[PDB]
Amino acid sequence: DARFLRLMKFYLMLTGIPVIIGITLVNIFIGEAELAEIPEGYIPEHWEYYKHPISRWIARNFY
Amino acid sequence: MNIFTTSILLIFILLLSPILISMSNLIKHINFPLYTTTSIKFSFIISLLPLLMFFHNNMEYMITTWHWVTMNSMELKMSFKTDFFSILFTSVALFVTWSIMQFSSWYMHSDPNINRFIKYLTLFLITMLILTSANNMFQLFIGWEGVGIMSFLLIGWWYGRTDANTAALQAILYNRIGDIGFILAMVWFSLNMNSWELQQIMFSNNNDNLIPLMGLLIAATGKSAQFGLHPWLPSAMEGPTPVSALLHSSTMVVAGIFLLVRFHPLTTNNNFILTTMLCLGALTTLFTAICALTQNDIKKIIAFSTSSQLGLMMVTLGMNQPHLAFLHICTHAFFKAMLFMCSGSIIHSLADEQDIRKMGNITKIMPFTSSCLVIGSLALTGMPFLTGFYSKDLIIEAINTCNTNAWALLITLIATSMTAMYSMRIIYFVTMTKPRFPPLISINENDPDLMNPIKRLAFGSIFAGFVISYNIPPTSIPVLTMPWFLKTTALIISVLGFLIALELNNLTMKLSMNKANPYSSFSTLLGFFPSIIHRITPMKSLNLSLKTSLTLLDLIWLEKTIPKSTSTLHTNMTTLTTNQKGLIKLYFMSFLINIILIIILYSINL
Amino acid sequence: SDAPPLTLDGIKDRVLYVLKLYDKIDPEKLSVNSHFMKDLGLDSLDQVEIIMAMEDEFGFEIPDIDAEKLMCPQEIVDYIADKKDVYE
Amino acid sequence: QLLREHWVHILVPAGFVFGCYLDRKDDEKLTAFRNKSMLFQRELRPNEEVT
Amino acid sequence: KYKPAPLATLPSTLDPAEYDVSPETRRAQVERLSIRARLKREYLLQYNDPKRVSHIEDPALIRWTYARSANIYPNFRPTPKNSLLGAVAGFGPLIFWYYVFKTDRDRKERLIQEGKLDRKFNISY
Amino acid sequence: MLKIILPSLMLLPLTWLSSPKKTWTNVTSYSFLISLTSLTLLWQTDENYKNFSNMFSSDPLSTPLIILTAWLLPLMLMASQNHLKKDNNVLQKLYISMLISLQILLIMTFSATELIMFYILFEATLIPTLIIITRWGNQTERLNAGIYFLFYTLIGSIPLLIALILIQNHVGTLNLMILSFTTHTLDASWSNNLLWLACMMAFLIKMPLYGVHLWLPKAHVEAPIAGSMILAAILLKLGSYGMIRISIILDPLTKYMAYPFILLSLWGMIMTSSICLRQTDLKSLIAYSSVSHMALVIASIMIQTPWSFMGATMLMIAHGLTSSLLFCLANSNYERIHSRTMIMARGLQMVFPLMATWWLMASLANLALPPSINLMGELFITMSLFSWSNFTIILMGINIIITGMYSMYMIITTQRGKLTNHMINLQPSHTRELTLMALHMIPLILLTTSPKLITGLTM
Amino acid sequence: EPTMQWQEDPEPEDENVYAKNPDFHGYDSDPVVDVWNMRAVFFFGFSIVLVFGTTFVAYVPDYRMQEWARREAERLVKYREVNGLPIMESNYFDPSKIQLPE
Amino acid sequence: AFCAPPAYLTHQQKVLRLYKRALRHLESWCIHRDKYRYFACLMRARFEEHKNEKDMMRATQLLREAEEEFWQNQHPQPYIFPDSPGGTSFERYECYKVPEWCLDYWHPSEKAMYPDYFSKREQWKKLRMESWDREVKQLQEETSPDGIMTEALPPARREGDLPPLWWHIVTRPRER
């Protein structure tokens, strides 16, 4: 049981903590964005109607 | 307006922190009980601030921390309502729990899974604080059921004490029988007002709104101790004394009354509830006081006393003094906990002998616990200025001053007497007669972790009642115009109880042989109500679940009907269609019948 | 608040203390093997009351199956020792 | 050698590739209504080739 | 004084059929004892049997489970009062609940058709 | 969707040709990769449902089932890795192949639009289950159990198909959302009534009522961990999904074509919850609990209210996971003992100190302890039923009570007594089974946290 | 003569794995295989799937528009509160373009 | 609770048990030990009165009236002894009273420490297998074909060799 506990905590923390840290760095440096109204000369793209940087990044790269 | 929410979330964060530590690997290196005790102390010191700001502003507060979902016009979110009730109950509960944790750290040495015990305690504490300072009835149900399961575990901590398992099962059954009416209320409100929150429910202050009130009423009768569903409070005592106090002196029972009082706005415009709150709560001040005259176990006696006080508070609710009821909860907690604390000290000093019948001379052999026990006993009797008075006597004013049902009033006063009766019973049988306990002695109470908590709790039980009665905003308008024989009734009648208990306890001597009289036998055996209920209801319900459903429906008929019938049918048809022997003399006759049939069919049909 | 465990010398001294405070037949001089019915001409009533006094002296209870058969202080002590698991 | 053993780990990635490619072929089919709908009908700004 | 019951059986002592001194009944008791002792000894020759790497099988338990689970339909013989109790449990209560619900729904429907039942705030349903 | 299927169609040859020492790990990890990739469906930015072709589709009501299936696959694998340990590599490979075929079929059906494709897949689900149950059981009645399973299912299947034909002819097509945008109303005669029947009877026979709950216990008992898992989790859910997707047309019939079925469902919930008290066989107890909850699901499906549908989906997912977990625990306690009986092994928690906390965390989710999707669903469904009538809270409460009872009875006859002394075969917990428990649990936590995914059509 | 039993191997025995591989994990009797498979399970199913899956989901945008809709309702309520219109008309479709029988 | 009882009983033990029960219920009724002694002496006199009588008639009559009087004048809530049934310690420690065979499945990294004690387990089990088979013949030789046996167990009629069936008694954990 000590073994299961320790190994699960490892194989979680291992990538949970680096990821959470990347998330914090993103929220701090990049952070969220603004509700800039729509100009009459620009036709926004699917990677610009979403707020969060990670969300719009994925929507621009993959989807 | 930022320090407030800061504190109100910081207390929960503190209580979390240990639990988190439980996950980690430090416990095997660290003194988890002291860790948790001190975190609780600082949680209390924090909770104090709200009290100052609230008495200095009287500004209630309402918060919506986190938005959970949005279920199509019926949202949900972690909403708190820091008003008088909860902002005070947090402080009281912590002031008690700190002492309880020290007492446990001292009382449960020689046991390995003590850190487990502490984690369970603080989990219950978090759940109760949620229930207390919660606004959404859903959050409140969360607190409800979490408290239930925590009590289950704690009554069962010794998972070999067979009857303890049954006690826990009792508890769960009755708490669920309350949850029934609670879900009834939730549903009625989510339908007729679209919301679960007290804010948007207050607007039901005009309609019949009687079914949800019946639901909350059953919830009270269940989670607290009342006539139909008390029997689960005495059995918990099978568990340890610290929890038998915390979970059964100031928590897990006050929950129902807390709920009713938070819902009071709708109870002032329903003259039926106002009544049924008297034929249900005052009665319990009799059907337990009776059982609190012969019971020998200290903890059983204390639990019956608790049921009595809770019935008294439901009565004052019925007659509309809810802030009085709440103040009484607060005060009552202090000494009802110190009593269990002293009893646990006594027991651990001795060889696990709860019975009064085998103890005595406790004053001389152990002055401290006896002094504190006398303090608590007189406070519960209603001594004029020991934080019992400041609620009990106003309640006994109103009970006779208002249009209260006669029999209810009457049995209530009888119970106010029986309080002093069994208190002096404790006193005599434990503190004034001879040392009828075994010869060996290994007493020790000079330990600080067991001498300081009682001291703090005594100071509290002596001061906090007065402090609160003079510092809280004057919610209601009292009545200070009546005769002396109605302003001093509780005092007079408690003195009467003292005298009568003295006379009778002294009559216990004189070689007046005893006789098994039926009134006293009834009292001792609770009234035979468990003895019949728990012996017929289970039997019949289980015998039905076996005979009718399992055998006579699910193994007999629903198989003989569809599948076995199809089987027999097709089997017989196959027997027929393959009973044939290989004779052309017959096969050709059959061919001929078929030819005839076909010709005739064509002829008819043209 | 746990006191220390029990040893054979303590048990024996206590049992002699009690069986000496007894008054009916004991001539205040009990051999460890001072058989009750045989070597002291005692009664079943007396033996049972002795067992009960010992039960009260040591808190626990002695079942009838063995109360009826105990006929020696040494046997009482052996029983208590095999029940409390003393003398590591 | 070892490829007879350590090659099997190439299928699943190849299966996922093939799946995305087949979905791309399907979506290239049904190309009708590319911009003829009545709620996303643009003007096809210059240098912005079709979806 | 005291009377028996299906719950509170007549305790051991008071039982008139006890205190009997019949040689046949005492012999039956001693036979029960022989049986029980043989059982306990066969059980203790396995509880302590060394070189053991397994557990014990409780054939009484297995037979009890068989008789509660699968020996039922074969030895089952339909008769009246049995068919009767079955049809009752299978029909009666369903139909009672059904009349209840249908009456309630028709009440609600006629009420609404009249246009009376206060349905304010019943926005989510 | 091929991105989810094709790899699941490659795990098969992978299993066939991989070496014994490595097939288990390879196939397991890659199935986990499949589970991961199965989340692309959750990018449901806007309300426009997802459509990939005339042959596939997704939806908020289907995606959960898809992910749950792709994630129950590897758990079946793992839980099927200590027994059949002395069975040949070829045999265990067959077992893996059957599991994977189940996965693929379930995905294709929970995704497909045309109910006829849905149906052929709903009936192809059998062969692997029947096989798994007959060729890997541990008793003899597994044969009769498989027969009952198969024939109940096919009897249901037939009139469903006949009605699908009548539809395909009267209406032009069978594609969903076209059935919606071109539905109509029926003269409400005996013809259309028997049509309603022939359309719902199969889905009901599968999602068991009181009357036809008989093939469930036999299956979950005689069959092994994987068959029990998949039954309790999905092969029931198929009926619910079909009924949801199909009832869109039969309006209004389902107002008076429901009273008998609602009545049966409620009464059966009650009687089965009661039997769960005095049912010795642990797996049988679990199966009857599943019946008790699927009765709620059905009562919530019929009356067609949005609250009801969301509660149905919530409780559906919750029960799936919780039943898989309880069955893992049962199997665990069985491999050490080889006797399903509840009263044989007793007074654990002194040698399996942790496992209990994987027993406890299940019961609490069965008896609807909040905050759990279980209670959210039970409660929303009770709300819908209270609106539909004021005299059903009675049965809701009786069921809640009897559940709060037998869950703890189960906890207490296996983890609360005093330890036996002849169970020397108590091999301590395996990291593998602890992992299975943790994996069945954690998602409950995350979904209790953020349930907006798991709501349904109406949210 | 009395009878005979169909030739069949005897009931195998109950054994222990920890007696020969106290490094056990539950998967196989080959220790290296046990170790590598449990590491595979954990990693592929605790480090990647749970973590990255939770991350993906939690950072999904405006699931079924429950955010865009709040925004839109705020804007519409502003518009209508100002212009004096009511926030919700009891008739959805224009009753002018519609036509009915007698 | 180690030795087992006989099937039948005797007037002797019946009366003894009635006596002990009544005296306990009297200790419960009349709390003060002085009153207890007084009434106990009274009961002793009541008994010694009819003691010398031997007629089975009077025996049964008095016994069956005594049991009725006892059941009708007993204490509703009697004085239970904690360490015995009904009390508040019965089984309280069974949750900690683990048996030994849990030992075998320890890990070597753990039994690394506590080395001495595990240096003696082997020579204990070694004290079991070397003297097991003998413990069987001692009975299978003395398994009196008469076939009328009790639950008692004979000792090692030889010297040096050990008794039969000592495992389920020795190693029984402490009470704590």
Side-chain angles (χ1 to χ4, degrees), chain C residues 40-51:
Chain C
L40 298 163
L42 302 205
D43 308 349
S44 47
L45 270 48
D46 293 278
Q47 188 273 330
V48 181
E49 280 199 30
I50 299 277
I51 297 289

Side-chain angles (χ1 to χ4, degrees), chain H residues 100-157:
Chain H
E100 88 295 353
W101 52 256
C102 319
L103 294 194
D104 310 334
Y105 309 99
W106 278 112
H107 202 248
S109 158
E110 285 170 349
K111 48 169 66 202
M113 58 164 186
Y114 296 81
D116 302 7
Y117 174 29
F118 292 123
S119 69
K120 304 168 186 194
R121 203 177 155 67
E122 310 202 346
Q123 75 179 359
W124 261 105
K125 268 171 179 160
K126 182 61 56 50
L127 201 57
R128 195 188 141 186
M129 214 177 306
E130 83 186 40
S131 61
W132 167 232
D133 295 355
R134 171 56 180 188
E135 293 169 32
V136 183
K137 309 179 192 61
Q138 194 179 305
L139 292 85
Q140 304 216 354
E141 191 211 7
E142 289 287 60
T143 181
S144 175
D146 187 350
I148 297 294
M149 305 92 83
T150 175
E151 283 161 281
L153 299 168
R157 269 70 174 270

Side-chain angles (χ1 to χ4, degrees), chain D residues 20-34:
Chain D
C20 191
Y21 174 77
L22 286 186
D23 279 329
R24 273 204 299 129
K25 284 286 277 286
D26 289 330
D27 306 325
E28 163 155 357
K29 294 176 165 47
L30 300 175
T31 304
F33 295 174
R34 216 167 203 166

Side-chain angles (χ1 to χ4, degrees), chain F residues 350-351 418-421 423-424 426 428, chain H residues 91 94-99 101-102 105:
Chain F
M350 296 196 294
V351 301
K418 57 176 55 149
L419 174 42
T420 45
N421 285 29
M423 303 301 169
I424 296 149
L426 294 165
Chain H
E91 312 168 319
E94 295 265 320
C95 47
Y96 310 160
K97 289 188 186 193
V98 289
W101 52 256
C102 319
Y105 309 99

